């Protein structure tokens with residue numbers, strides 16, 4: 001009954017006769033399944049975890065320059081030299097500046113100069129490769145028990161969590177008291193994980209095209225890298241200036257964090273917060289129910305009377321939910337329930353919370369049902385003090 | 395002699411007869427002035443200071459969100475409320491989320507929710523208005539004294555610094571021993587300081603168009619602001635998400651420092667380093683020299699002989715500089731100097747360091763001159779041991 005209240009809720013039924021139904025689950029979605037003489041079940045995808053992906057590449061988005069050093073020669077004395085030209089942590093550039101008596105040389109002319117500065121990354125983002133085969137999904141299965149506190153309860157302590165791995169065969173789920181259900185889920189698509197990259201910048205994350213990702217004009221490190229200091233193409237976050245031929249300067253280019261966010265505007269978002277998976281694709285599972293059975297079909301219709309404990313309320317999909325309490329001494333018994341026409345002559349609506357049964361004299365029971373458009377009567381209990389509640393839909 | 399060595403050096407002469415010459419100075423530039431019976435002078439613009447300009451607007455480029463709070467109502471219960479909706483430091487957004495039994499409401503439906511978070515700027519940039527009227531320029535005037543250590547000496551302790559303010563009348567400069575010169579400088583143009591804004595992001599600075607600046611999609615504060623917390627349009631660095639109608643989130647948009655740098659690529663740069671003014675416009679000054687006079691026109695040509703102390707060297711503009719020392723007993727006397735043709739019959743070149751005079755037996759003297767293209771002889775001193783140095787130009 002976890003789904004009652006969610007608006008992105010889908011109602012699914014199987015092929016008449018068969019005991020297998022196919023459903024699709026996406027974060028933020030909810031699915032209510034039904035089948036002849038089978039308990040109604042609610043399904044919700046709680047999490048999508050990718051177990052250790054490959055780091056295609058690592059980009060620097062904010063850096064710092066330090067230990068600037070420089071060397072220079074006089075006209076006709078060749079190029080200057082710095083050992084830092086070999087230290088892969090440093091970025092360098094050669095250039096010319098004016099020279100002559102006033103600054104040390106015997107000749108006036110252009111003399112070589114070389115400037116180097118240590119480049120240290122302060123913030124970085126990673127591109128990872130995800131393969132469908134290894135994506136674990138956590139799904140919560142909550143059956144329509146009618147339990148006092150189950151309507152829309154997200155605590156998860158009414159449902160049964162199951163972990164599923166796409167290409168790791170069938171998964172078995174034991175629903176206490178109802179039997180056992182089976183799920184065969186398919187990874188295959190929503191999108192292709194070969195030409196796409198999962199990009200992570202702290203708690204934010206998107207799925208982007210490989211090409212686009214590989215063409216980002218930022219300093220980088222190969223996926224395999226550990227040291228995290230020998231960045232390739234540091235020049236992309238650096239700027240060398242020698243405007244008047246007097247001296248050469250180097251300055252960092254400033255955090256690209258936002259520029260990135262701005263360029264990722266049109267990209268598929270995965271999550272903005274630590275534990276708020278937004279999208280993840282559509283998970284398809286085939287549900288087997290031959291080993292699933294209704295609960296209490298050994299009972300007899302109660303004979304006593306009921307009291308409305310929580311007035312009839314309509315959900316965002318036209319179904320109604322009501323909560324009644326038994327006052328009869330029948331103990332474990334089936335609750336009489338039917339939706340009749342204005343004159344109580346013919347039956348018009350169906351139960352979603354099929355096989356409503358009391359379990360304890362004082363444990364109220366929730367019943368979801370689908371009345372017909374227009375007028376109808378909700379008849380609860382049997383004759384002596386039988387509840388006859390009128391309702392109008394949509 | 396400060397200019398000897400700089401490549402962006404310009405040689406300027408006045409209208410024959412007049413004693414007024416016009417020059418143009420720009421950072422990274424140098425100007426050598428000459429005039430009949432007047433000392434040759436070198437001019438260099440050392441600094442451009444804008445005295446307390448007006449802050450047109452202040453933009454936030456990096457922010458932080460904190461103290462997130464939220465309020466919500468049930469379907470049909472109207473809008474939620476937070477006092478932070480009035481606290482100008484907070485950014486807020488109203489929205490809907492699903493409600494029903496499982497999360498507190500008696501009815502299932504869409505209920506109002508409102509979310510607020512405190513927005514605190516961590517880094518910002520300012521746009522300032524510069525008025526030509528109030529721009530102070532520091533200029534160093536260094537005359538061609540021929541002093542042993544003056545060639546290309548940037549120490550500034552050979553020159554005379556003068557501060558100039560465009561529309562504050564004429565400025566008087568006293569050149570020790572040479573008299574006094576006068577400068578009348580004009581602010582008027584390079585560009586229109588009305589439709590342009592000086593933008594500063596730490597030590598970096600550009601001149602940009604007012605419109606473009608005012609249209610930057612960032613959070614701002616009016617120029618006059620002091621508090622620095624009641625940012626207008628905070629929504630531009632913030633993002634509210636309510637993808638599944640379950641709850642609403644807010645996340646900062648990330649430093650725009652680099653994006654700004656990137657958008658400022660084609661803009662006019664003023665400086666990248668704390669004290670490295672790159673550009674500043676072209677400063678025009680009219681130089682009056684009627685009160686300026688040569689030094690030592692009471693002396694007689696030396697009669698002794700000279701020794702070359704620093705061999706003839708050519709500058710990047712075809713002039714040559716030489717340094718000689720006197721061995722004669724003439725004390726304060728004019729140095730005989732001329733550039734003759736191959737046969738020493740006719741005169742061909744001019745002195746830049748006009749009126750070369752010894753001052754102390756042992757103080758070497760530097761002379762800059764402009765020999766003719768091709769062959770020529772540099773004749774120094776008189777007959778007995780007269781220096782006859784051959785030279786070839788360009």
Ligand SMILES: *[C@@H]1O[C@H](CO[C@H]2O[C@@H](C)[C@@H](O)[C@@H](O)[C@@H]2O)[C@@H](O[C@@H]2O[C@H](CO)[C@@H](O[C@@H]3O[C@H](CO)[C@@H](O)[C@H](O)[C@@H]3O)[C@H](O)[C@H]2NC(C)=O)[C@H](O)[C@H]1NC(C)=O
Nearest residue numbers: 147148149150151152153154155156157158495496497498
């Ligand atoms: C979602 O479910 C939780 C807990 O689920 C269990 O609830 C019990 C009643 C039973 O159905 C079991 O099978 C479910 O898994 C709900 O939290 C529970 O709330 C009730 C009442 O608020 C608590 O019962 C007790 O009531 C007596 C009153 O006589 C008090 O003295 C006790 O202190 C206590 O409140 C019960 O302890 C809670 N159980 C847990 C695990 O916290 C929760 O309300 C529900 N969500 C909604 C909105 O329906």
Ligand SMILES: *[C@@H]1O[C@H](CO[C@H]2O[C@@H](C)[C@@H](O)[C@@H](O)[C@@H]2O)[C@@H](O[C@@H]2O[C@H](CO)[C@@H](O[C@@H]3O[C@H](CO)[C@@H](O)[C@H](O)[C@@H]3O)[C@H](O)[C@H]2NC(C)=O)[C@H](O)[C@H]1NC(C)=O
Nearest residue numbers: 101102103104541542543544545546547548549550551552
């Ligand atoms: C730029 O100029 C500075 C100083 O300018 C002054 O220099 C003196 C000589 C004089 O012309 C005065 O009018 C100038 O304003 C040059 O620095 C000076 O360097 C000299 C020699 O290196 C120093 O002279 C002394 O020499 C005796 C040797 O007998 C030593 O014992 C002394 O310690 C001292 O070195 C003099 O002190 C320096 N003056 C200053 C203010 O530092 C500088 O070299 C020059 N730049 C170039 C490259 O030409």
Ligand SMILES: CCCCCCCCO[C@@H]1O[C@H](CO)[C@@H](O)[C@H](O)[C@H]1O
Nearest residue numbers: 048049050205207270271279280281
């Ligand atoms: C089509 C959507 C792209 C594939 C979705 C898989 C990405 C899962 O998202 C990532 O899962 C990690 C698992 O530990 C978490 O640590 C991260 O917080 C989360 O961003």
Ligand SMILES: CCCCCCCCO[C@@H]1O[C@H](CO)[C@@H](O)[C@H](O)[C@H]1O
Nearest residue numbers: 442443444599601664665673674675
């Ligand atoms: C056409 C170029 C725009 C006008 C140039 C004037 C800007 C000088 O630039 C500013 O001067 C300030 C004065 O204190 C300094 O504090 C700053 O470091 C500097 O950026």
Ligand SMILES: *[C@@H]1O[C@H](CO)[C@@H](O)[C@H](O)[C@H]1NC(C)=O
Nearest residue numbers: 066067068069084087089118
């Ligand atoms: C950079 O400077 C620091 C402090 O001056 C020094 O300790 C360090 O050795 C320098 N780094 C390198 C590799 O030159």
Ligand SMILES: *[C@@H]1O[C@H](CO)[C@@H](O)[C@H](O)[C@H]1NC(C)=O
Nearest residue numbers: 460461462463478481483512
């Ligand atoms: C934000 O939270 C801090 C610490 O929890 C608290 O001291 C402060 O009062 C809060 N700020 C506001 C204005 O709500």
